[PDB]
């Protein structure tokens, strides 16, 4: 059942293999959802606080620990029985990934304890949801949870794509410098609506008696592949004018000189609409609801002018069997002006 | 399902024999877009979506790329770059009852047109006028759905048709749905034609020394063309070169 219970620099982390194509000894320019370089990453941690965070366009997640506190995640919208939600939980032997109409707890967790104080026999109480009805997807595989664990979560094109990397580091309070690309872990053919997520923690009872979250953005990256096809470096093309130059020249080095790398353009701040100040409506109804229509050989022509034409009244009507527009979109008609209209 | 609440079945990791459907005498409509119906058994897809619903005969034409109308606009929209097949048949003997079958609904009114493969099953009152409806239907406040009321004596255009739309997913990813096309022995060090899980071409296949990662299915050169593949049965990495040629 349910039980009631800072920022750091992203540096150059959060880069993953954008596709499943082998490349080597080459600089490849790719546009994808990446964690921007030197971005603001939120740092999360007696008290308990494990908040539900927005997913936005995708999430960069990382944690440093030897205690295996982070066990899984919940992804979804309402995170209740009203909608489908994705549950990812890792245990000692397997990872369980399910999509169900879960009724999640406000403070979901796995309660860790030693069975009758046998330290060689650990057990856990699964307290994440109260129900899991109408499951549409289930997947079970090998588990993937000083030790820095990085993940990238994308929800796109019918797939929930997870990338990961596991490396040792010599710091706790922040993310490491240097470059390491995350490799695709699993592509889940789920196809659900995700706007929010939260981390599932393993909590020893004695704890109540850290991880980093960044967001992905549509950015252009220049990725450097070494001879073994490993991504060893990258340039965030929108980070600064130098990175922009590097991407323009398709190189990680720039020679002395002046380069044209982009175009500067002042953007509009307002939309100014100026139409003739008339209120009289165009007499379309008088055409459509005429008692008598002409024969096609002697068709009638009504000239319409100097009026306001609301075409959505006609288009959104259930009474017409045919409504075909040529040279113009039926949904853009109310934004257009004409010199004349013939009916 | 009703067309406003159409069903989507995800098909993967299987052998798809499409000639069984195409060569059937039981379908009245079988229109393919972005692909030839007679080449389907030679193709591999990353995924296949089968969307099923009921509409009336006259509306079957709306189930196509670049179409307009109540169905195309408010119920089931296909993309202009749609790759797939639209299959339909008359179901008057199943989906029509004397006095009318009012189980099959469609969306008649909507604030805006649907995006491709968007599914809208809300029943919020539609505001046709400028005055808020506040959930109460009446003048200029419409119930967005309507029934077909299928009857066995209706003209063909008003008879129920069962529609299945097979959307073919073609991404740069491992293909999981392939035709009945049989495999052959792998031949190396010769000029051959080849087809690797849908990837066709001509050249010489050799053992690769490229350090492919477990997730990588094929490689490309600086020209961005396939120059290596992972054999879908042996997981062997093969290098691809063109068959010897030159000017004379």
């Amino acid at each position, epitope marked *: 059942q349910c039980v009631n219970l800072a920022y750091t620099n992203s540096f150059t982390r959060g880069v993953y293999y954008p596709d499943k194509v082998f490349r080597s000894s080459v600089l490849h320019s790719t546009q994808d959802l990446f964690l921007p370089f030197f971005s603001n990453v939120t740092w999360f941690h007696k008290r308990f606080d494990n908040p539900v965070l927005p997913f936005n366009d995708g999430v960069y997640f990382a944690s440093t620990e030897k205690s295996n506190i982070i066990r899984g995640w919940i992804f979804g919208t309402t995170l209740d029985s009203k909608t489908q939600s994705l549950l990812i939980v890792n245990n000692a032997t397997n990872v369980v990934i399910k999509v169900c109409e879960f009724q999640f707890c406000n403070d979901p967790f796995l309660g860790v304890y030693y069975h009758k104080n046998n330290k060689s026999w650990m057990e856990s109480e699964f307290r994440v949801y109260s129900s899991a009805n109408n499951c549409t997807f289930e997947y079970v595989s090998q588990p993937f949870l000083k030790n820095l664990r990085e993940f990238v979560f994308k929800n796109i094109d019918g797939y929930f794509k997870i990338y990961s990397k596991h490396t040792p580091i010599n710091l706790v309070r922040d993310l490491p410098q240097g470059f390491s690309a995350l490799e695709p872990l699993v592509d889940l053919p789920i196809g659900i609506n995700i706007t929010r997520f939260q981390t599932l923690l393993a909590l020893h009872r004695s704890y109540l008696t850290a991880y980093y979250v960044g967001y992905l953005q549509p950015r252009t990256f220049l990725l450097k592949y070494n001879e073994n096809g490993t991504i060893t470096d990258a340039v965030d093309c929108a980070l600064d004018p130098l990175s922009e130059t590097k991407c323009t020249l398709k190189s990680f080095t720039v020679e002395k000189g002046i380069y044209q790398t982009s175009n500067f353009r002042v953007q509009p701040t307002e939309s100014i609409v100026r139409f003739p100040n008339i209120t009289n409506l165009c007499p379309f109804g008088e055409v*459509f609801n005429a008692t008598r229509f002409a024969s096609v050989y002697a068709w009638n022509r009504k000239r319409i002018s100097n009026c306001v034409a609301d075409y959505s009244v006609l288009y959104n009507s259930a009474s017409f069997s045919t409504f075909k527009c040529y040279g113009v979109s039926p949904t853009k008609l109310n934004d257009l002006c004409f010199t004349n209209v013939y009916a | 399902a009703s067309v406003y609440a159409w069903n989507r079945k995800r098909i993967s990791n299987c052998v798809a024999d499409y000639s069984v459907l195409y060569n059937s005498a039981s379908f009245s409509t079988f229109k393919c877009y972005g692909v030839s119906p007679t080449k389907l058994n030679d193709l591999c897809f990353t995924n296949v979506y089968a969307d099923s619903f009921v509409i009336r005969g006259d509306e079957v034409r709306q189930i196509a790329p670049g179409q307009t109308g109540k169905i195309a606009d408010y119920n089931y929209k296909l993309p202009d770059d749609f790759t797939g097949c639209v299959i339909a048949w008359n179901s008057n003997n199943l989906d029509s009852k004397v006095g009318g079958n009012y189980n099959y609904l469609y969306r008649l009114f909507r604030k805006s047109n649907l995006k491709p493969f968007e599914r809208d099953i809300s*029943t919020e009152i539609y505001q046709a006028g400028s005055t808020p409806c506040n959930g109460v239907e009446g003048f200029n406040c419409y*119930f967005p759905l*309507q029934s077909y009321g299928f009857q066995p004596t209706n003209g063909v255009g008003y008879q129920p048709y069962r529609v299945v739309v097979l959307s073919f997913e073609l991404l740069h990813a491992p293909a999981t749905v392939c035709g009945p096309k049989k495999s052959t022995n792998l031949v190396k060090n010769k000029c051959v034609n080849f087809n690797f899980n849908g990837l066709t071409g001509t050249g010489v296949l050799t053992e690769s020394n490229k350090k492919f990662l477990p997730f990588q299915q094929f490689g490309r050169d600086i020209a961005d063309t396939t120059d290596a593949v992972r054999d879908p049965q042996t997981l062997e990495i093969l290098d691809i070169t063109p068959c010897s040629f030159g000017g004379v």
Partner: nanobody
Amino acid sequence: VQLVQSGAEVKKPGASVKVSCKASGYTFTGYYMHWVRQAPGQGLEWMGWINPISSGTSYAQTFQGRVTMTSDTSITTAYMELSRLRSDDTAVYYCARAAPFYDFWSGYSYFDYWGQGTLVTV
């Protein structure tokens, strides 16, 4: 188009009467079903309507709170239940068809088909 109503009813004051109207010959859910009352020697009075597709209703202020309209599309039948009957509820009750409010040519403004009236005596 046919509208067939139930037979005559005799009720006591305080009792409730439910009058049915079976529709045929048209798409049941494509029209509103209205009820119109005609007391002896009197004219026609509109009671309200039901929209079978949504089971949405609207009632005349005269009957609001006493009349409940329902329908069952599986048998294309509309119902009107008038509770807390009074002696002045003695009338012939008609069901009538009219277009829905979204009808372009205002077919909702009038009643094109009527059933045979059902007499209720109180």
